[PDB]
Structure formats: C-alpha cells, structure tokens
Write a protein that binds this ligand. Structure first.
Ligand SMILES: [Cl-]
Ligand SMILES: [Cl-]
Length: 162
C-alpha cells in the first residue's frame, strides 16, 4: 500500500465531471476543477487542464495524469510550508502518507490550520491527536474517510485500508 493506492481508495475514479461531497465540480481521482456552480466554467477549466476539447469527459490515462500532478503538488506544498514541513519531517512513512492525504483533500492552508493536532502529532501523542482531529468540520462532513486517515495517524499502520 502506498499513497496513490490510498488516495485512489478515498477518492474513487470518475471520468465524467461530477460534483463532490461539497457540490464542487471535480473529475478523475478527486481533481477539483472549480468552486463556481457553473458547468461551463467547469468544462473550461477542464479543457485548460487537459489541453484539448474534452466535452467534460476524460480518459483513464488523462485522469491518472492529473493525479500524478496533484500528488506531486501536495508533497511539494507540504515541504514548502513552514507549518507542515517539520510535522512531516518528524513522521514515519505511513503517517507521512496520512498527512499528504489530508493535504490533497483540503489544501495546505486548510491543514496548516489544525494547529493543535499538528503539534500533537509532532509530539507523537497519537491517541490525543486522533481525538482532536475528530473535532472538526472535516470529520463531521466526511466521517468515514476521516476515520481511515485518523486511524492511520493513530496506529502508523495501513489497517484502515485493508
Ligand atoms: Cl491542472
Ligand atoms: Cl466519507
């Protein structure tokens, strides 16, 4: 198991523009296209991202291509971020994967916001950080996924995913 596999399970794979759990236009493996309630705006972004006249649909290859880009941007975003980097640096491999997952989903800014949890993670207080993570809009809105990510942090294993 690895990050790609992990995120592929959490996000799914849709080749046709759909709306996310917050109603935003997304496509592929959780690739956000736009917040804007407009499908054309969606289609526009989409063609702009793929580089062709898509008509709201992409191929698997395409989908995977956006995913590679996004996973890469998420890692680099963490390593760039003053608040995240040290957390990341302090973590073992499995847990790093959990942090990347949160970053892929909510953005670096969103995550940089779990100040308290971050600190707990850095201090290796697993159970406490898990509890704290749960007190969030995130957990409340996407509780199942949130639980898998939270368990991964708590345990340092991939059990939540097997
Ligand atoms: Cl893009
Ligand atoms: Cl969920």
């Amino acid at each position: 198991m690895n990050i790609f596999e992990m995120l592929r399970i959490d996000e799914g794979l849709r080749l046709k523009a759909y709306k996310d759990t917050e109603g935003y236009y997304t496509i592929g493996i959780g690739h956000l296209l736009t917040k804007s309630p407009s499908l054309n705006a969606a289609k526009s972004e989409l063609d702009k991202a793929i580089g062709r006249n898509t008509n709201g649909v992409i191929t698997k290859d395409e989908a995977e291509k956006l995913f590679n880009q996004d996973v890469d941007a998420a890692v680099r975003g963490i390593l760039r971020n003053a608040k995240l980097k040290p957390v990341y640096d302090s973590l073992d491999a499995v847990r790093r994967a959990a942090l990347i997952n949160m970053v892929f989903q909510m953005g670096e800014t969103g995550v940089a916001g779990f100040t308290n949890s971050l600190r707990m993670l850095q201090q290796k207080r697993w159970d406490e950080a898990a509890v704290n993570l749960a007190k969030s809009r995130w957990y409340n809105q996407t509780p199942n996924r949130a639980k898998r990510v939270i368990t991964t942090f708590r345990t340092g294993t991939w059990d939540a995913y097997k």
